[PDB]
């Protein structure tokens, strides 16, 4: 056990489909990532209008 | 976005009438009312469905990705 986990979990209450993943180095030369997840929401009982 | 396929209210198909509508506006030089009338959109819900729509996909296609 030489590694600690620093993984990022999907929102506990949300769900959907991974829309698009972006991998890019930072200004300080740090490999960072932005993951966009897409979910279609349909008007339900309780939605505000 | 893009022209809705069918009318929300009643359910009449309108997605096949968008380009025809545009042509009736630019080619035959009619007003929106008559153009909507000729396409068989008598009920004001479908009439709304086409008249109220904004075709945003044409602006979306301007990007290269």
């Amino acid at each position: 056990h030489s590694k600690r986990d620093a993984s990022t979990p999907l929102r506990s209450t949300e769900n959907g489909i991974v829309d698009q993943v972006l991998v890019t180095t930072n200004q300080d030369g740090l490999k960072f990532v932005k993951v966009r997840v897409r979910t279609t929401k349909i008007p339900q009982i309780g939605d505000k209008f | 976005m893009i022209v809705p396929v069918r009318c929300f209210s009643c359910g009449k198909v309108v997605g096949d009438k968008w380009e025809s509508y545009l042509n009736l506006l630019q080619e035959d030089e009619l007003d929106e009312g008559t153009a909507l009338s000729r396409l068989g959109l008598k009920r004001y819900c479908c009439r709304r469905m086409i008249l109220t729509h904004v075709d945003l996909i044409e602006k979306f296609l301007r990007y290269n990705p």
Binding site: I17, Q20, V21, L22, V23, T24, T25, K31 | N64, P65
Partner: protein
């Protein structure tokens, strides 16, 4: 695995220990390619 650049129509396959930048471009914005395992859609 493989990736695809943002502001050009390329198809990089550089895995780890590579990353940025891009083949014949210069920009460091890399997107990931679509999965092969297809996903269904309840057309409703």
């Amino acid at each position: 695995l493989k990736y695809i650049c943002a502001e050009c129509s390329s198809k990089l396959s550089l895995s780890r220990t590579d990353a940025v930048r891009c083949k014949d471009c210069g920009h460091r914005i890399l997107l990931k390619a679509r999965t092969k395992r297809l996903v269904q859609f309840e057309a409703r």
